[PDB]
């Protein structure tokens, strides 16, 4: 059994397509509601689980918090695909550029388009894009504090070697 999100037990959380707009700790501009600064929000969960969840090859999705965790678990693999050989001062800028560049949302090019509900309206697509850009900017910034933990000029190999690993053999 792979590790599912803690937030699938949460209820009446806001939703877009069928992503969960889970509480977030961040500085980036966007629609995600502030988390408690003392608590693990979905990005501390997604970074904590990623290195275990990308070895499994069979993952049942319980609800919209797992659909969110999967998008995070896939975007960590894109970031570790980018980061090889960078200085932290370059990696911040390269992975923010990766986070902000134009991407396909579910319902548009998207790999898991079989499992994610398309946006409910022309307006739901914008609240989805402005969430997923805020999410993946924070996810990149948070990840970099782990991969450049002990030394600031060389990505720690214990994080970089998952760049070949690929959650359930899917990628963005």
């Amino acid at each position: 059994p792979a590790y599912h999100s803690s937030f699938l037990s949460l209820t009446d959380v806001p939703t877009t397509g069928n992503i969960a707009m889970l509480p977030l700790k961040t500085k980036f501009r966007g629609p995600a509601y502030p988390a408690d600064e003392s608590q693990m929000d979905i990005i501390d969960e997604c970074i904590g689980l990623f290195r275990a969840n990308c070895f499994f090859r069979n993952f049942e999705i319980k609800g919209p918090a797992d659909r969110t965790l999967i998008y995070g678990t896939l975007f960590i693999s894109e970031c570790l695909g980018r980061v090889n050989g960078l200085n932290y001062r370059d990696a911040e800028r390269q992975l923010n550029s990766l986070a902000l560049e134009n991407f396909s949302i579910p319902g548009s090019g998207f790999p898991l388009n079989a499992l994610y509900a398309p946006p409910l309206s022309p307006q739901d697509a914008e609240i989805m894009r402005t969430y997923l850009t805020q999410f993946r900017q924070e996810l990149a910034y948070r990840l970099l504090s782990h991969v450049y933990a002990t030394e600031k000029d060389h990505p720690s190999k214990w994080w970089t070697c998952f760049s070949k690993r690929r959650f359930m053999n899917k990628a963005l």
């Binding site: 059994p1 190999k157 214990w158 070697c161 690993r165």
Partner: protein
Amino acid sequence: ASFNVPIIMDNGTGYSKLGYAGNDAPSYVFPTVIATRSKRATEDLDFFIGNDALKKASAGYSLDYPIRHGQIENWDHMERFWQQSLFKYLRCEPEDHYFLLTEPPLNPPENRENTAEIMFESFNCAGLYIAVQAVLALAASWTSSKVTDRSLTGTVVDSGDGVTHIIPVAEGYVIGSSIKTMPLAGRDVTYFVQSLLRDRNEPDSSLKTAERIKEECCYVCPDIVKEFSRFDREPDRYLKYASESITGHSTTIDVGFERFLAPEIFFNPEIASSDFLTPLPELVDNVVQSSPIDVRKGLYKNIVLSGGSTLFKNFGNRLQRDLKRIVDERIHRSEMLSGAKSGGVDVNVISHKRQRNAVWFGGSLLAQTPEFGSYCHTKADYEEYGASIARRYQIFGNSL
């Protein structure tokens, strides 16, 4: 019948263990490998086997492993491996001795037929017993061969280099309707250790180095998302291993999260395969619950571990706690519906001194019994009925 000590051969996917019944260890334990070439024809005489065939990779021979997933699957190589075992290492005469051979529970009838015709027509041995290997491994558990030390009811978990299977046996009978088998063991966890060294791009990732990192450095943790987190908090857990290359020079390997994530293949086999999804503690509960009701207290009370790939540090305790968690959760569901208490069930997973080769010690201990010559296919039965005499499963229920 001849009186000579029956010869015992546990041909594993990893190691062949060879010897004579009634000795206190195998005469040989060496890899199930054959080195072959890749005006008279002699390329079928030039081969080598075992520890003397690892020395031959640099002399331009191709090593191949004729047993894969616990089954013989090259019959040319296995016949040459047996002739060389019998006439070089065991140095015996087949016409004088009964042989105990071993195979997994779910082997095809075709492999017992091929084993029988090779033994009776090529070597001409006096008689043959083809034992289901985990049924023997129970008999290594006893404190002695004597009748008062026996405990003929217990689940036996066997895990070698090529197959793991769980056999329930009760009152000396193998409960064949309940055998579970999974072709994921000591080699599949080596290919996973090898796969990790290779993704980190370490200086050496040859099979012999992943094989050594398993048994030097790896262990079974309680839970991998806490163990990944511990490897951040506790940086002395990244061991450094010194490996010497095929061409005779030093290297150094950092060993990482494969120290726990590799043995986790047994307790989460989704890491290794899309096909075998059930983890070993739940695979054991499926054995004991499929088994008839009155033996279940006895089958949980004595879960014997066997075969080299069960030796990982903390393997017995992980299996005991995860199986005890499955079992007391199911009993507590039943206390809930009744409102009454229960006496529960004790689950003991038995690691023991002969665990590394338990199938051989089981075969040795059984073959000493005066009745053994009557359980063999004698070559007189072979000359009457041919190699089809070995085709019937002893273990499973057969129609007809």
